[PDB]
């Protein structure tokens, strides 16, 4: 899944 700070 996406990193904690992505998007």
């Amino acid at each position: 899944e996406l990193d904690k700070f992505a998007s």
């Epitope: 996406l2 904690k4 700070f5």
Partner: antibody
Framework: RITLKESGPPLVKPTQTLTLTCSFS??????????VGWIRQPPGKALEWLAI???????RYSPSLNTRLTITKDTSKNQVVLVMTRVSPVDTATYFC????????????????????????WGQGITVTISS | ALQLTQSPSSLSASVGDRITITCRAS??????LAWYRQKPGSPPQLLIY???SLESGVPSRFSGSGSGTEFTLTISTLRPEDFATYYC?????????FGGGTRVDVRR
Amino acid sequence: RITLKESGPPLVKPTQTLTLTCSFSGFSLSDFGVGVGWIRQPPGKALEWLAIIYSDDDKRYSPSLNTRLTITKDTSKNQVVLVMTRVSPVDTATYFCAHRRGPTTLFGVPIARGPVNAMDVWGQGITVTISS
Amino acid sequence: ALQLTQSPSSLSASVGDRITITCRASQGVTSALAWYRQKPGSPPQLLIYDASSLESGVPSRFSGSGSGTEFTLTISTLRPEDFATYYCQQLHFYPHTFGGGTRVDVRR
């Protein structure tokens, strides 16, 4: 100045449980968005990411090792512990813990996330050998 | 999962050369990529964070560029301490992958 240091047993036998401790200074795991991760390096091989834990207590693990890893923090002791169960010889490696910055804030307002993209300070690493 | 391929895996060079190491990702990782230099017997050391930002205290001969799926680290004037192994790391998707590393050794 941020420093981290790994501690635990240098030798462990197959099927046993390995508990590694990362003790650090210079930051608190209660600071905003900070993370502490674990990375390992079998002799002569590449770095391999294992897990990371943030100050808001979100935890993430390598999918390949998920079932054998537990990461936890002890904020008041400035330590992060990684527990690996059922080790086998292929787990022999040098294990490093490392700091991950949280976003930069201005008057307590997050304004830059670029600094989270790296593990910026590393511990010297602790060599662990798995053999019966 | 996401794959990070470094090139070349090994590279020979001499003091004063300009070298460039590249890292390609199987899916785009935006700018969430870091470069490290690791000398024998020591932990990796952060050189470049967020694809191109120079880490504090890191010498200016190190430079990083690229975003998406292709990144490059270039050392403009190789110094003796640069004979080492370099790694790139992606931090956009979990797990936070490392490339296979590229060994830089003394050419002869």
